[PDB]
Amino acid sequence: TKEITLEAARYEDESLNLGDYVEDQIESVTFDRITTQTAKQVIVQKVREAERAMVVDQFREHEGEIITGVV
Amino acid sequence: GPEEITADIPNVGEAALSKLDESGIVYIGAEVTGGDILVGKVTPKGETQL
Amino acid sequence: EFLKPRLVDIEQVSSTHAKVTLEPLERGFGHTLGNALRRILLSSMPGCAVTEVEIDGVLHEYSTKEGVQEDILEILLNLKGLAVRVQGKDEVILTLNKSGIGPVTAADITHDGDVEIVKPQHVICHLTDENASISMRIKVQRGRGYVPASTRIHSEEDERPIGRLLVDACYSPVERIAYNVEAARVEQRTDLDKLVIEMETNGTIDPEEAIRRAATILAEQLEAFVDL
């Protein structure tokens, strides 16, 4: 499950190479009502990442901000 | 709305929840120690913030 | 210029309890060796009491399985007093199974060669229902001293199956120890002191090996008295 194989999977005729980390799996749905705390933490991390990306695209594109400001 | 007695409990470790069932009540005959949960009761609060 | 006390005679008046005598011991040493040996004997010896159980059809020690005329708590309290000697390794699993009318005793425990029972006539519990059966799992391990049930929960190795039941350990093979000093044989001299020690055990340990182990512990621990 963590890493598929083809050499030891000769019954499967080795449809791909040994060590292909490409997308070869699928899921359907997840509720995770009890895991709502983990979902909220992941959403907070995603929000922080999005805020960092927005700050980057707003400042580093114009080399930060070359203007008089305040601290 | 009323509060629920399910296992939907946040910010608690996996060990603190491994002593519960799918409904939210400890199994009969569990060696529970001090500082642990027996039934998970969670109540809905007001919005108070958006 | 001293006389080395050498074990010369051992009297097993009965299987349960015996006595040991020591030969020439110089005056004054009688209450030295006797008290120290008695106290190390009574305190620190290798015990092999039962530490864990797994009954077939109960969930906790406070329930009552159908067909047995004793409470499960009574079952564990009775089983705590069972004496077992272990020779092969430091932890062996013992299996039990019996059905039908009549009590269950130590002779009903499976008796693989490594583990030997000392008291076959010890009773565990009566059984009344005709088609009643109990298949309990017995866990025994070596140790010393007195480890209670509460303190051993410190392992925290996910040792929480519902059917596993804890006990209170009784790691003390000896039960009653007595000793006294008396005038020894003439030994072509005057004032020869010999002491006799009466040992009451559950039968797990023979007195000679017990004395050897106790004296070895005392000597090895006292060997720290070589300072700078």
UniProtKB/Swiss-Prot annotation, chain A:
Organism: Escherichia coli (strain K12)
Role according to the record: Part of the processive rRNA transcription and antitermination complex (rrnTAC). The complex forms an RNA-chaperone ring around the RNA exit tunnel of RNA polymerase (RNAP). It supports rapid transcription and antitermination of rRNA operons, cotranscriptional rRNA folding, and annealing of distal rRNA regions to allow correct ribosome biogenesis. Participates in both transcription termination and antitermination. Involved in a variety of cellular termination and antitermination processes, such as Rho-dependent transcriptional termination and intrinsic termination.
Induction of the gene: In response to low temperature. Negatively autoregulated. Induced by cold shock (42 to 15 degrees Celsius) (at protein level).
Covered range of the whole protein: 72 to 142 of 495
Organismal lineage: Bacteria, Pseudomonadati, Pseudomonadota, Gammaproteobacteria, Enterobacterales
Protein name (database record): Transcription termination/antitermination protein NusA
Quaternary structure note: Monomer. Binds directly to the core enzyme of the DNA-dependent RNA polymerase (RNAP). Interacts with nascent RNA. Interacts with the termination Rho factor. Interacts with the phage lambda N protein. Interacts with SuhB via the AR2 domain, crystallizes as a 2:1 SuhB:NusA heterotrimer. The rRNA transcription and antitermination complex (rrnTAC) consists of RNAP, NusA, NusB, NusE (rpsJ), NusG, SubB, ribosomal protein S4, DNA and precursor rRNA; S4 is more flexible than other subunits. NusG and the alpha-CTD of RNAP interact with the AR2 domain. (Microbial infection) Interacts (via N-terminus and AR2 domain) with Escherichia phage lambda antitermination protein Q; this interaction (AR2 domain) releases the autoinhibition of NusA.
Observed effect of gene inactivation: Mutants are sensitive to DNA-damaging agents.
Localization per record: Cytoplasm
UniProtKB/Swiss-Prot annotation, chain B:
Top-rank taxon, per record: Bacteria
Oligomer and partners: The RNAP catalytic core consists of 2 alpha, 1 beta, 1 beta' and 1 omega subunit. When a sigma factor is associated with the core the holoenzyme is formed, which can initiate transcription.
Cited function: DNA-dependent RNA polymerase catalyzes the transcription of DNA into RNA using the four ribonucleoside triphosphates as substrates.
Annotated family: Belongs to the RNA polymerase beta chain family.
Name the UniProt record assigns to this protein: DNA-directed RNA polymerase subunit beta
Organism annotation: Escherichia coli O157:H7
The encoding gene: rpoB
UniProtKB/Swiss-Prot annotation, chain C:
Disulfide bonds: none
Family per similarity comment: Belongs to the RNA polymerase alpha chain family.
Region spans: Alpha N-terminal domain (alpha-NTD): 1-228
Posttranslational modification: (Microbial infection) ADP-ribosylated on both alpha subunits by the phage T4 protein ModA. ADP-ribosylated on only one of the alpha subunits by the phage T4 protein Alt.
TM region(s), chain numbering: none
Required for interaction with Crp at class II promoters: region residues: 156-159
Residues of the whole record sequence present: 7 to 234 of 329
Gene Ontology, cellular component aspect: cytoplasm; cytosol; cytosolic DNA-directed RNA polymerase complex; membrane; transcription elongation factor complex
Origin species: Escherichia coli (strain K12)
GO BP terms in the entry: bacterial-type flagellum assembly; bacterial-type flagellum-dependent cell motility; cell motility; cellular response to cell envelope stress; DNA-templated transcription initiation; intracellular iron ion homeostasis; nitrate assimilation; regulation of DNA-templated transcription elongation
Root EC class: transferase
Comment text on domains: The N-terminal domain is essential for RNAP assembly and basal transcription, whereas the C-terminal domain is involved in interaction with transcriptional regulators (such as CRP) and with upstream promoter elements.
UniProt-recorded Gene Ontology molecular function terms: DNA binding; DNA-directed RNA polymerase activity; protein dimerization activity
Keywords assigned by UniProt, alphabetized: Acetylation, ADP-ribosylation, DNA-directed RNA polymerase, Nucleotidyltransferase, Transcription, Transferase
Domain of life of the organism encoding this protein: Bacteria
EC number(s) recorded for this UniProt protein: 2.7.7.6
Protein name as annotated: DNA-directed RNA polymerase subunit alpha
Catalytic activities: RNA(n) + a ribonucleoside 5'-triphosphate = RNA(n+1) + diphosphate
Signal sequence coordinates: none
